[PDB]
Symmetry: C5
Subunit: 147 residues, 5 copies
Amino acid sequence: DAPHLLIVEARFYDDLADALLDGAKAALDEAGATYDVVTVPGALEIPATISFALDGADNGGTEYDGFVALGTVIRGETYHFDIVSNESCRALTDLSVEESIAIGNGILTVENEEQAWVHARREDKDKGGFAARAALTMIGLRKKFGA
Amino acid sequence: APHLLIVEARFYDDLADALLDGAKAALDEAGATYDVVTVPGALEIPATISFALDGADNGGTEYDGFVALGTVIRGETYHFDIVSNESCRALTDLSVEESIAIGNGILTVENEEQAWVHARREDKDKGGFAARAALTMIGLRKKFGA
Amino acid sequence: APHLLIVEARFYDDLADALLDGAKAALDEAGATYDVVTVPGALEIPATISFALDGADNGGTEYDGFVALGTVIRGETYHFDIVSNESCRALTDLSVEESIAIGNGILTVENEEQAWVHARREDKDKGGFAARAALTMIGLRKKFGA
Amino acid sequence: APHLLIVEARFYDDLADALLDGAKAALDEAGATYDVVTVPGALEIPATISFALDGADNGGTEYDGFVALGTVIRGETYHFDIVSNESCRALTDLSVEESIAIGNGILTVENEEQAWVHARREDKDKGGFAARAALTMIGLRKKFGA
Amino acid sequence: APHLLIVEARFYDDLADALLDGAKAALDEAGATYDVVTVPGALEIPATISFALDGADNGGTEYDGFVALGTVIRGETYHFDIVSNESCRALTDLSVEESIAIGNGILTVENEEQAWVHARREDKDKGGFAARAALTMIGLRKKFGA
Ligand SMILES: O=c1[nH]c(NC[C@H](O)[C@H](O)[C@H](O)CO)c([N+](=O)[O-])c(=O)[nH]1
Ligand SMILES: O=c1[nH]c(NC[C@H](O)[C@H](O)[C@H](O)CO)c([N+](=O)[O-])c(=O)[nH]1
Ligand SMILES: O=c1[nH]c(NC[C@H](O)[C@H](O)[C@H](O)CO)c([N+](=O)[O-])c(=O)[nH]1
Ligand SMILES: O=c1[nH]c(NC[C@H](O)[C@H](O)[C@H](O)CO)c([N+](=O)[O-])c(=O)[nH]1
Ligand SMILES: O=c1[nH]c(NC[C@H](O)[C@H](O)[C@H](O)CO)c([N+](=O)[O-])c(=O)[nH]1
Ligand SMILES: [Ca+2]
Ligand SMILES: [Ca+2]
Ligand SMILES: [Ca+2]
Ligand SMILES: [Ca+2]
Ligand SMILES: [Ca+2]
Ligand SMILES: [Ca+2]
């Protein structure tokens, strides 16, 4: 009866990933929701992964009520940092719309590691918790609208 | 009488109130009805409209149009620019792909000051503008017989 | 003679008049006829063309092409490059997905000065260029027998 | 022998000539045949390829590949970035979604000086590079038996 | 034993070799096999994977995953961000729409220096990272039973 979420975490920056995951798990536990955690190398493969889960579900696999995308992108000198954020979020958005699924976006895109922590920590901006809660809210709306 | 779904990303509460106030006032004056659904951020507004559409296709409330409200204030983190681009990008695709009337009231400003200049109905009234746009689009949807 | 639908985003009233004047001159000059539909902003131009396409598939007016007109001036707020990007993005995709003739006259400028330099038929004439591009695309569409 | 469609966005005539010369040369050298269709700007190149594909699916000329030729020179207007992004973005989706071989010779430069360095066959020969890329992709299209 | 398709955009030959060496080393170390196909630039990598997918649906080599390798160095021209943007964008959509395992080794850097810091297996080894990312995705694709 409790929603079962799939947390797809891009573990590029491990310590930041743990902050986000701790934020997300905290919010889900707190809400009485259960979850599975899957780790991917970077934000770029987060959408594909949710896609794998959806197709998996259609093949009798675990059926997730929603998803929590966790990740961190720190703009350094390279332009690929803009690309990771943009493409991962872009694909997630399209995904949430095209598949009409509940997705909490916890993909952090900051200038430096200092703000990354400010957003990743549950003690701070708690983006991971905000994302997990966002997924729940969307799970509720998805249910309300009878999508 | 058109019945709209107002989807507000209530990130900044005060601003959200201003925008919603603008949207509601504009629709009231046009004699249009509406429901208000709340989401945490602009990023979930498009999926929300999607939910509404699927629900409608499942016998649920059928909406004539949508008013998306939200506010994104660019501070320091590169995270603000993405919220604006995606939400509005997704809304644009959605309006086209689904051929629906969408008033885009997702405010993307530099700082809180201009946010209020745009959010307040006494000012630029972005919320009202978006609501009116939805009505205009609802009318065009009907004129072309879409 | 080709019959085009001119979809103008009337945000800046005077600049819209300039683009519209430019678009009409080019079409009148070419002998093409047209209807003009007005929307509040560039963001609703793609959906409007979408409405017209579905309207036509429902026995409504069949347009040979489209001329999208609009102007976005990048001021101080971040709510400008998004309008042009998304409006143009959806227009391009629409032209490919639906294989239709679309003249893109959505003007994206840094300031009011270039807006006028591009919007005036007497100058850059962005509207006429878009109108002419639409006609060109109508001819190519027929030439390829698409 | 592969037969390709060169779609040239002829906005800057001289540069267009340089790019076209480069593309034709590369195609001639490879013993490939080609048709040339001209469009006003890079923005209509993707729809044009789309017209040709639908045309082909209606018994029209069947092309083995495409060579998109164009030039965008970034100056002041933000519309220059849009043309570059949109045309190239649509071409890419088109190459993927339709599984066709496309050589991208849409030159996006800062100034005219570098435009010539890239456009001239004697120089960087962007046109020939795009023509050669199209050929390469045609061969690959066949190697995979897609 | 997974069989991957390495699609390398060989624009800067030496850097391409660094990335390929990094990709093969990672795949050989995992016991995975692979075929290597060369394209002229990052813009054709997505269409190439598309070719491989179709070819597979026509009884061609069935790949368990893909490793996209390439390098884009941002200079003065704006044609650099577009190559990285579109290629990566196309790859991302492809991986989602086709539910395929794709390791993105398309290196987007500002200068030759970071290009070398990332392409060398001895250093950041983006080629190996992409290859390993592809393997991880292959494993996940199977764990989820997609
Ligand atoms: O999640 C992230 N992934 C990153 N890797 C890119 C991509 O997400 C994939 O892991 C890999 O490129 C191949 O799929 C990042 N950077 O490279 O900087 C980053 O900041 N964040
Ligand atoms: O509506 C907004 N949402 C924001 N959050 C992003 C997103 O809309 C979602 O709430 C959440 O990311 C997970 O879905 C914002 N910022 O982060 O700055 C903002 O300014 N405005
Ligand atoms: O056509 C324009 N519409 C604008 N409005 C945005 C949008 O096009 C819609 O009118 C409205 O947002 C709700 O749909 C603009 N700005 O806001 O700056 C602009 O410059 N040009
Ligand atoms: O090919 C180009 N077309 C341009 N026109 C834009 C577009 O390609 C179409 O021609 C027209 O806008 C209507 O579709 C350009 N600029 O405006 O600068 C440019 O630099 N290059
Ligand atoms: O892989 C790359 N291809 C490049 N060429 C662009 C494109 O990838 C194709 O090779 C060609 O344009 C025709 O499709 C690059 N630049 O132009 O700079 C680059 O840096 N990297
Ligand atoms: Ca750790
Ligand atoms: Ca009809
Ligand atoms: Ca001046
Ligand atoms: Ca045929
Ligand atoms: Ca097969
Ligand atoms: Ca250095």
